[PDB]
């Protein structure tokens, strides 16, 4: 009881119901239920993470309507790689194609190969035929 | 230990150096007083001998 009493609230402005997982944000003296962590940070102005609070405490504080940006990102973890790599890929069916976007270093193992030297490929677009080589069409 | 912990949770943190000497010396006193009661004699009839 002396090491952690019941009255210690308001330790941080972003709190989450320890039981229900719900997210709330504090403004003035009220608690507003927030749509997601991204909008909770922007409303408060602090780059924190939710603090778990016992559900019996949050029932004693006045409510408010919903707040934030709907559908915004729910988690942040900035990353910085040594080099930036992006690829746009095309795969044809056997009269039908699908487009894939790759972010990161590609996997060149197997029969995959760079189209260097005299290698080439031919494709159709807008009726015309285009020859791909030296990295140009 | 509980009495000491309870003071830190209040933030007084009066312990360390000057303060810690009290509980440090006081801790030795209890061990002597209980050791003194057990050291009443020396003889054995243990299972290995029986």
């Amino acid at each position: 009881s002396f090491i952690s009493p019941s009255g210690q609230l308001n330790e941080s402005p972003i709190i989450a119901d320890r039981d229900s997982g719900a997210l709330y944000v504090r403004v003035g003296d009220r608690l507003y239920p927030a749509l997601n962590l991204a909008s909770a940070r922007l409303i408060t102005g602090r780059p924190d993470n939710p603090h778990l609070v016992r559900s019996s405490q949050i029932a004693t504080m006045p409510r408010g309507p919903l707040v934030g940006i709907p559908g915004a990102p729910s988690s942040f973890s900035p990353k910085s790689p040594p080099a930036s790599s992006w690829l746009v890929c095309d795969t044809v069916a056997t009269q039908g194609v699908t487009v894939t976007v790759i972010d990161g270093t590609p996997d060149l193992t197997g029969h995959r190969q760079i189209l260097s030297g005299s290698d080439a490929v031919v494709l159709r677009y807008g009726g015309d035929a285009w020859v791909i080589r030296e990295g140009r069409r | 230990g509980g009495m000491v912990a309870m003071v830190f949770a209040s933030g007084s943190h009066v312990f360390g150096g000057i303060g810690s000497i009290f509980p440090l010396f006081m801790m030795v006193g209890i061990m002597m007083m209980m050791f003194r009661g057990m050291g009443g004699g020396q003889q054995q009839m243990s299972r290995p001998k029986l």
């Binding site: 403004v27 003035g28 409303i43 006045p62 409510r63 408010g64 309507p65 709907p70 559908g71 | -």
Partner: protein, 134 residues
Amino acid sequence: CWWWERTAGENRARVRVVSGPTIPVAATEMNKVVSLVKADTSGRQADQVYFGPDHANFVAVTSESLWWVTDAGARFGVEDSKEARDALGLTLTPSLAPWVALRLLPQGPTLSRADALVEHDTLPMDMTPAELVV
């Protein structure tokens, strides 16, 4: 204030009228009334909502319809079927409430399994919102 009162199983509720200097809530609780946004400017929606002691969350109205009321003051319709009940919980029997009052709370979409089964890349934006003042 108009007042509606009922005990479970009674054939009829008691209707009464109260008046006074202030809304019937103790001065110690006066500070936790919720203030709605009220996007509907017509006289068909309330301005404030208060949840006193021994309130009811799960409610049924006069063929009957089931509704779930949130602490934020919004109401959502719940399907009568075994699937919808069993998935949310709500197996206990609901309390009764009068439609002339319950209709004053803002309405959200109904919680039906058949429409929860959807995917989105991005969601639509909400027109006519209200300011959050610090």
